[PDB]
Ligand binder design. Structure first.
Ligand SMILES: [Mg+2]
Ligand SMILES: [Mg+2]
Ligand SMILES: [Mg+2]
Ligand SMILES: [Mg+2]
Ligand SMILES: [Mg+2]
Ligand SMILES: [Mg+2]
Ligand SMILES: [Mg+2]
Ligand SMILES: [Mg+2]
Ligand SMILES: [Mg+2]
Ligand SMILES: [Mg+2]
Ligand SMILES: [Mg+2]
Ligand SMILES: [Mg+2]
Ligand SMILES: [Mg+2]
Ligand SMILES: [Mg+2]
Ligand SMILES: [Mg+2]
Ligand SMILES: [Mg+2]
Ligand SMILES: [Mg+2]
Ligand SMILES: [Mg+2]
Ligand SMILES: [Mg+2]
Ligand SMILES: [Mg+2]
Lengths: 120, 325, 63, 144, 192, 54, 113
RNA sequence: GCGUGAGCGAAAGUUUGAAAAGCACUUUGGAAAGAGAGUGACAUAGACCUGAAGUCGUGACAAUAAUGGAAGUACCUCCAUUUCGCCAAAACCAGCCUCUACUGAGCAAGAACGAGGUCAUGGUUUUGGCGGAAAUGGGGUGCCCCCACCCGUCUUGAAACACGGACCAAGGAGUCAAACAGACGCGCAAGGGAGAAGAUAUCAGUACUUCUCUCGUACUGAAAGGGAGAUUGUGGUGUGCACACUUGCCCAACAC
RNA sequence: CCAAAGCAAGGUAUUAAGGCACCAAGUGGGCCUUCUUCGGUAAGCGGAGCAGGCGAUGCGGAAUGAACCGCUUAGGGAUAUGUGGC
RNA sequence: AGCCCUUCCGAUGUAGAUGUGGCGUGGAGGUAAGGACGAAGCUGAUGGCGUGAGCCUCAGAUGGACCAGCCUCUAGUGCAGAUCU
RNA sequence: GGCCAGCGAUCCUUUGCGUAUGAACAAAUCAUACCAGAGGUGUCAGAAUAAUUACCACAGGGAUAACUGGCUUAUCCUUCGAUGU
């Protein structure tokens, strides 16, 4: 189970980034890069992420139904509480953060269009 | 159960049940304890010469000569004459505790813990989170455990095999290795360790006849089911390696390690250790309805502050009214 | 030299431990023997009636 | 592991736990067991009371193989009998037979409450074992 | 600026975390730490603290000693009361000296392969603390037990042998070395 | 030492008064605080305290 | 607002060029510093611990977090008001061009951009 | 190299550079050398990688027993951060603090009103000042006032007229083995474990196993020797978690 | 036990977490002082009893002082004190 | 760099004991990453962080090619003092 | 036993006492053992021990003399990796 796995990868894993004594996750699927069981979605039976996808917000999801078939264990879906509505569809507790990342993904996307355009 | 993806292509060639070994307990501490001690057996004696630093004639000049009483090399006509000698502190002198050829270089591990460990590190490779956790790029992998068609060992040419690795999606973790290769940091490089590179997928052949094309194909370690090595199953002593089981190597993986309920046919009376927990996710229990039912469901100075005193002594205002006059 | 200084201090650190309670190491043994031997004869009979008593309570409890 | 020695903890604390006074020497008393009858007398007498002296008859050239008489109690004969074979053993019926030399035992001490009969087959027996073993309806048969 | 005399001496030394490296103990402490805090039950508070103990202080119990202590407990139970679960925070070991045992329902960290088979040969369940929590979240008719530790051979060595009251076992590779004439010996008995 | 006046008792109990609670040194602030400490139908007020200690 | 802003220097580092300024606890009965006479240097102790919610916080207000490559920046994407990437000293000026025009696009702070 | 000798016995990295391309030629000098020039990507790479400390020279600068601590301030800051927010001041609320009675004029005596203080107290802003610079912080140097006995050491006692202490760099001291023990971790558990060795597959490793052996499950006696259940089951009793039931059973454990 | 069934024996104020075990170190030159003494002509002397100290501990004070006085000690601020002062 | 918050009590200390997701060193199994757009080393009114051991950054008008992080393993592992060499 | 002081390990010897061992077997002898005394360690919790060194030596000691200051009228406080009578 995940209770056991997390207690295995907790002291070390590819994803733990214990730098300067600070501990952030390199995990693709973590939302706030906080090395926590709530978030370590690579580990969780179910998981949700709200990364950008070329201007578009992307909301990768991982219902457990796929089980252990990594090639297809994760299911993307491109797309502001609506994204949170999708993420809660799989992980209800992740949603409050999944909304707030999903926003900050938007301000980043707006901020960089301002920056990428200003780089001209 | 587990589908057996063909080497030739994406399509599965059929399904096989998980051998009970993958259901076996994952105990990282034993994989670590066994790995730690097991890695010492590869290990090789070093020692200083029996009589280094001590190969001189030396005597202390005694006291009464305005010099420390360390032994001094005698004679004359040389730079080393009168030079201190033998003590660990001196040049050319002896090391503190000279190294011996009879250090305990190697270790005993109980045959059972060595087995508890190979079990736990295979069971740890059945779990994609642990296996991608340790470093492997498993994102293209069709499934974990990745069992694969038996004729994958029929390959002769190396690029027959390279075609196979892309098919099963393993090549992204083999690219992980070819790219991970560089000159070792530190001294180890002038000690025949000049190149370090990351562990990649461990193909596991049914028997010795499979290897040829998969030799040389760098970043692809080969393994034999009939001699699985915990030094390879848990590199670094961390469980979770990526293993490409061959279908033949996989189906006989309970013939080797046995069930929780049935002895190994090769390892004597060995039998998979019973989980300490029948229900290994404690958090699901705590949140269970059977368990939820039983759960248990400004002023400082009180004498001079007016509101504080009126609170401690409700009658105080009825008393202060008495004070007027 | 024989000064007893710092001794009652060093002794009252872990207190003067008070003596064992009378209900503990209450061995007889070196007790005036003839009494001691008759006491065995009674205590052994207490045991046969203690056990005989529990055998009673169970048979009584089959009801 | 050198990492874990308190050698490594007290790097910096000048006397490595041996004390500023009363300095860590060499052999502040003698080598080994020196003064077992002198300045370490209080020590051996407290802890190793029988240590000094002689107690009995000598046995020149002892041969322990002839002396080899390992024992199994009645209470432990289930260790030898197959649990499957031992399943039904009425005293008046057929019994499991248990050679004890095969199993590495020589005498048969008659300890606890045997109750399942067996025909134990052993070199030696206790006064109480052959009695108990019979009263259970089993039988020791002497062998060598 | 405070008398503290006798305060430090009253400080207790207790384990507050397991030294066990075993992951499952930690999922098992994770449970009963929770369950001990979130329930009013004193059973969870015992299973939780014992679970934090040394394997020294978690002594194994004979299945023989469960069958004894259990029937001795259950024999008095009023008819139609099923017997208590026999929880132990330790290993449960088979006993050759008791071939036939009652359909016990033992619950322990670990079972010998012999204990587990005899336990099920009697038809008794051999359940873990996981479903102990799921069947007895509270210690409801559990019968928590401990394995013995006085007969442990380490404690036979406690004290001195040479001291008159004592029957400590002297440390000796050589049994015949410190053997002694009856005359020269410490007095066996001595009143405290 | 001496014989406190009723006023001296008030000031200490109201100003400097601290209950032991779960071994905690707890500043008196509520009569709720006092009735919980003293499970005693007699001792409820901080006025109960000042009468007792006077 | 720090307890102590000064280093706790080793006693008599100033007289002996070889001694590093780095702290060693004084020993020797007669050490003026461990006997803690008032005119002497101080020793470090638990009491100089910094306030614990302002601890590790650089005057920028960020906690520094090491960064080595452009991927690390996303470890700070969602907590960019709490952590500030400090690019490692040994990343190339090459790669730093890439970390920096990307640490700009993401709104993550960098201590040495 | 040393010693009559037996014998003792060093230091030394040619690690310039990719290559010698190892500075031709001009110029001063008797020369060594210097100034140019040249080679090379670099010659503060020049017969030499790096290039520390300490020491010294020099320039500039602050300055006027040592060191040191505390706190400021003066000046400087190739530093940090912040601002285009920083310094202030006032207010409000809270907190906090300070500032009759009896008696025969006195006390052993109680509050009240009123007012003040304060953010190195909490919360409420307001208002101004400053904004290539400002601002806070750090750093440096000096000063001021103040504090301050050289450290290590054995010792009852060290600033000692007690020992060791010129500088710096590199080195330097609880190690390895083994036998016990306790503790802690792990494995299995009335068993545990192998060792030597073998057999195999592929690499002094891993995997595998026979047969044994060994510690243990039984102790005791000098020894011959003998060798432990109770009246389908805790030998009893006392005190004894938990649970059960409104006392039972008691685990362990101690005691008898 | 008694002559005996009765006797004997075993059985139906303030405060404060108590006890027990294991392993192990350092230590085993002490010194001063309080009071009490003993020896010594006397001592900054030898010896003890008691307690407290220094040792191992600063800080504040007695101008100065190992042990006197006050107070004993995390990093700081306000307040108020202690011994001592003005 | 404590899951968060709340309240309470303690804090000296030689010999000594113990703790420490305590510091730091050479090496190893791992992981992750860096480097001729300049590694290590060294220099530093380079600041920053940490009670601290220390780490980090800046700058070299230093260097010239290796190498930090993290978990595990290891040790010939930390020096003002030995009339130390 | 004569109140209370009047006495002593291990090894060994020796004496007694009631079987045991001398291990291929057996008896006798011898020896050993158990067991209980005795022989003694008076340095009395128990090595078996003469001087000398100014020819002397080493490790230390101001734990300890002379000496050197102090105190007192001898102490042993400083100093024995040296304070010139
Ligand atoms: Mg050498
Ligand atoms: Mg040499
Ligand atoms: Mg003495
Ligand atoms: Mg210390
Ligand atoms: Mg020690
Ligand atoms: Mg010394
Ligand atoms: Mg000593
Ligand atoms: Mg001494
Ligand atoms: Mg013998
Ligand atoms: Mg026992
Ligand atoms: Mg050079
Ligand atoms: Mg002295
Ligand atoms: Mg035994
Ligand atoms: Mg003063
Ligand atoms: Mg402390
Ligand atoms: Mg080394
Ligand atoms: Mg400088
Ligand atoms: Mg060393
Ligand atoms: Mg004596
Ligand atoms: Mg003296």
């Amino acid at each position: 189970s995940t209770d056991l796995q997390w207690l295995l990868v907790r002291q070390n894993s590819k994803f733990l980034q214990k730098r300067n004594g600070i501990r952030l996750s390199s995990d693709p699927f973590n939302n706030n890069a906080n090395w926590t069981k709530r978030h370590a979605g690579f580990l969780n039976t179910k998981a949700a992420v709200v990364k950008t996808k070329g201007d578009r917000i992307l909301v990768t999801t991982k219902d457990g139904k796929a089980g252990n078939k990594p090639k297809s264990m994760y299911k993307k879906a491109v797309m502001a509480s609506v994204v949170s509505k999708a993420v809660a569809a799989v992980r209800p507790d992740l949603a409050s953060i999944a909304s707030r990342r999903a926003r900050k993904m938007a301000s980043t996307l707006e901020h960089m269009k301002k920056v990428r355009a200003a780089r001209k | 159960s587990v589908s057996v993806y063909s080497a030739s292509e994406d399509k599965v060639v059929g399904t096989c049940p998980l051998p009970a070994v993958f259901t076996a307990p994952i105990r990282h501490d034993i994989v670590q304890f066994v790995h730690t001690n097991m890695a010492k057996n590869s290990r090789q004696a070093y020692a200083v010469n029996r009589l280094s630093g001590m190969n001189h004639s030396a005597e202390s000049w005694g006291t009464g000569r305005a010099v420390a009483r360390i032994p001094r090399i005698g004679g004359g006509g040389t730079s080393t004459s009168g030079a201190g000698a033998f003590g660990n502190m001196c040049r050319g002198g002896r090391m503190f505790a000279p190294t011996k050829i009879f250090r305990r270089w190697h270790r005993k591990i109980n045959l059972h813990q060595k087995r508890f460990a190979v079990v736990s590190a295979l069971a740890a490779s059945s779990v994609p989170a642990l296996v991608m956790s340790r470093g492997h790029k498993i994102e293209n992998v069709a499934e974990v455990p990745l069992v694969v068609e038996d004729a994958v060992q029929g390959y002769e040419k190396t690029k027959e095999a390279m075609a196979f690795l892309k098919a099963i999606g393993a090549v992204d973790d083999v690219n992980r290795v070819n790219d991970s290769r560089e000159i070792r940091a530190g001294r180890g490089k002038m000690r025949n360790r000049r190149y370090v590179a990351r562990r990649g997928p461990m193909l596991v052949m049914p028997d010795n006849k499979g290897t040829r094309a998969f030799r040389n194909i760098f970043g692809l370690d080969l393994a034999n089911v009939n001699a699985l090595n915990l030094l390879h199953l848990a590199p670094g002593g961390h469980v979770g390696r990526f293993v490409v089981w061959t279908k033949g190597a996989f189906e006989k993986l309970d013939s080797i390690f046995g069930t929780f309920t049935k002895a190994s046919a090769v390892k004597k009376g060995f039998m998979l250790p019973a989980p300490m927990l029948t229900n290994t996710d404690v958090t699901r229990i705590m949140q269970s309805e059977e368990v939820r039912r039983v759960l248990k469901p400004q002023p400082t100075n009180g004498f001079r502050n007016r509101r504080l005193r009126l609170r401690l002594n409700p009658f105080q205002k009825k008393e202060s009214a008495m004070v007027k006059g | 030299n024989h000064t007893n200084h710092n001794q009652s201090r060093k002794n009252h650190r872990n207190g003067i431990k008070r003596a064992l309670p009378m209900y503990l190491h209450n061995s007889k043994r070196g007790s005036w023997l003839p009494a001691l031997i008759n006491a065995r004869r009674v205590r052994k009979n207490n045991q046969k009636a203690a056990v005989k008593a529990r055998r009673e309570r169970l048979a009584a409890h089959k009801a | 592991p050198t990492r874990f020695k308190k050698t490594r903890h007290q790097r910096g604390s000048t006397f490595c736990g041996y004390g500023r006074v009363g300095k860590h020497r060499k052999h502040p008393s003698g080598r080994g067991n020196a003064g077992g009858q002198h300045h370490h007398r209080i020590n051996f007498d407290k802890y190793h009371p029988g240590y000094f002296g002689k107690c009995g008859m000598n046995h020149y050239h002892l041969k322990k193989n002839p002396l080899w008489k390992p024992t199994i109690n009645l209470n432990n004969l289930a260790k030898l009998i197959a649990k499957d074979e031992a399943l039904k053993a009425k005293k008046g019926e057929t019994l499991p037979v248990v050679d004890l030399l095969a199993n590495g035992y020589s005498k048969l001490l008659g300890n606890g409450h045997l109750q399942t009969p067996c025909i134990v087959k052993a070199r030696w027996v206790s006064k109480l074992a052959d009695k108990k073993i019979r009263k259970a309806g089993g039988a020791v048969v002497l062998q060598a | 600026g405070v008398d503290l005399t006798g305060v430090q001496k009253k400080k207790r030394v207790v384990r507050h975390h397991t030294y066990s490296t075993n992951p499952y103990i930690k999922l098992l402490i994770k449970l009963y730490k929770f369950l001990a805090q979130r329930t009013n039950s004193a059973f969870n508070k015992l299973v939780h603290q014992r679970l934090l103990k040394s394997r020294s202080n978690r002594a194994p119990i004979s299945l023989s000693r469960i069958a004894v202590c259990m029937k001795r407990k259950s024999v008095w139970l009023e008819k139609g009361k099923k017997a208590p679960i026999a929880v132990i925070v330790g290993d449960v070991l088979d006993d050759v000296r008791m071939a036939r045992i009652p359909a016990l329902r033992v619950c322990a960290l670990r079972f010998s392969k012999s204990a587990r088979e005899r336990i099920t040969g009697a038809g008794g369940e051999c359940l873990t603390f996981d479903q102990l929590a799921m069947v007895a979240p509270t210690g409801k008719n559990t019968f928590l037990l401990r394995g013995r530790k006085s007969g442990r051979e380490s404690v036979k060595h406690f004290g001195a042998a040479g001291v008159p009251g004592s029957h400590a076992k002297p440390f000796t590779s050589n049994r015949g070395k410190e053997r002694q004439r009856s005359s020269a010996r410490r007095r066996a008995f001595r009143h405290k | 030492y001496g014989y406190p006046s009723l006023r001296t008792v008030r000031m200490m109990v109201y100003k400097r008064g601290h209950l032991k609670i779960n071994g905690q040194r707890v500043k008196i602030v509520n009569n709720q605080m006092i009735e919980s400490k003293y499970n005693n139908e007699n001792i409820v007020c901080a006025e109960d305290i000042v009468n007792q200690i006077y | 607002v720090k307890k102590r802003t000064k280093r706790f220097t080793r006693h008599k580092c100033e007289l002996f060029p070889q001694l590093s300024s780095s702290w060693r606890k004084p020993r020797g009965e007669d050490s003026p510093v461990r006997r803690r006479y008032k005119g002497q240097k101080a020793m470090p102790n638990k009491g100089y611990g910094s306030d614990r919610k302002t601890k590790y916080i650089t005057p920028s207000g960020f906690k520094n977090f090491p960064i080595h490559n452009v991927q690390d920046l996303y470890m700070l994407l969602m907590q960019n008001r709490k952590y500030a990437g400090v690019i490692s000293h040994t990343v190339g000026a090459k790669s730093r061009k890439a970390i920096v025009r990307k640490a700009h696009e993401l709104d993550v702070r960098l201590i040495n951009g």
